[PDB]
């Protein structure tokens, strides 16, 4: 069903991540982690404390869709194991320093030719598929995008609802 989904999104943030390659996104899904450029960590790590989902919407460029979305369980941290990120060209890895823990909520795709009916109140009215890295997206926006997507029937939300 949808009942836990519309739950965890209730009174949600929402921020469009775009990722210069796949890999990096495959990462994240494999273990649950996402790193950014310092002026989005800083937004990211407000909105953490500021509400009770905190919801990534992946997508990665050139690719025509999203891949997936996630919500913050943690604030960034630093001092892991370095993530084998793929930098992009002139991108340093001290620039991908802070680490946040991410849950999956969907890891399937999403064309951008579903979400042409939504626009994001905060992007101009734009379609919600264009915006820069770090993107906020409007609640009843992004409420509306994440429903889109196809069910991830391999995603429990008992563990997430805990979380909050």
């Known amino acids: 069903g949808t009942s836990k989904l519309k739950y965890v999104l209730q009174d949600a943030r929402f921020f469009l991540i775009k990722s210069n390659n796949h890999e990096n996104v495959s990462l994240a899904k494999a273990?649950?982690?996402?790193?950014?450029?310092p002026v989005n960590e800083k937004k990211l790590n407000l909105a953490f404390r500021s509400a009770r989902s905190?919801?990534?919407i992946f997508s990665v460029r050139e690719s025509g869709k999203f891949q997936g979305f996630a919500r913050l369980s943690s604030e960034s941290h630093h001092g892991g194991s370095p993530i084998h990120w793929v930098l992009p060209?002139?991108?340093s890895a001290k620039m991908l320093g802070g680490v946040f823990?991410?849950?999956w909520i969907c890891r399937r795709e999403l064309p951008f030719t579903k979400s042409a009916h939504l626009t994001n109140p905060w992007?101009?009215?734009?379609?919600v598929k264009i915006g820069r890295d770090g993107q906020e997206i409007e609640l009843e926006c992004g409420t509306q995008l994440c429903l889109l997507f196809p069910p991830d029937e391999s995603i429990d939300l008992y563990q997430v609802i805990h979380k909050m």
């Open 123 to 127: 992007n101009e009215h734009k379609p």
């Open 101 to 103: 823990k991410i849950d």
């Open 31 to 37: 273990k649950g982690v996402w790193s950014t450029l």
């Open 89 to 91: 060209a002139g991108m």
């Open 54 to 56: 905190v919801i990534l």
